[PDB]
């Protein structure tokens, strides 16, 4: 049998660390002229997108 494999099957150490950097890097340059408004606050009912 010549099946395949994953190097990091069922692993989360690198992925959790990796997910922080991509978001952190994007946030660094996110400050622009465009709106930086936070998502709507409250969980009763909304329609705004």
């Amino acid at each position: 049998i010549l099946g395949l494999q994953l190097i990091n099957g069922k692993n989360e150490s690198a992925h959790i660390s990796d997910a922080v950097g991509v978001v952190a890097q994007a946030v660094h340059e996110l400050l622009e002229k465009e709106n930086i408004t936070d998502p709507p606050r409250g969980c009763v009912g909304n329609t705004n997108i």
């Binding site: 989360e12 990796d18 998502p39 997108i49």
Partner: protein
């Protein structure tokens, strides 16, 4: 629905900008990413996942906002393409469910 009751009352209560999900420890029919995809995707909030291999979350028509770090099961075919090349194979027959 048990965790769908906290899609926003708990997840976005901190005014977060993304949600990270993982395959549950119980090897069920990969039911954990359905609520976050529909709920957080409804707000057009991109979501990320780990230990995720299903081709159902590929197109943007059903899931516009989804960026899984781990490529799905469908990438195992690409490896065989180069593998058989160094073994001098030209004709193939696949067994696919």
């Amino acid at each position: 629905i048990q965790m769908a009751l906290s899609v926003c009352e708990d997840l976005i209560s901190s005014q977060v900008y993304a949600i990270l999900v993982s395959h549950p420890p119980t090897p069920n029919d990969h039911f954990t990413p359905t609520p976050v995809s529909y709920t957080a995707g409804f707000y057009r909030i991109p979501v990320l996942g780990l230990t995720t291999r299903m081709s159902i979350y590929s197109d943007k028509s059903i899931h516009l906002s989804f960026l899984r770090t781990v490529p799905p099961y469908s990438h195992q075919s690409s490896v065989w393409f180069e593998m058989m090349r160094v073994y001098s194979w030209n004709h193939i027959i696949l067994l696919v469910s």
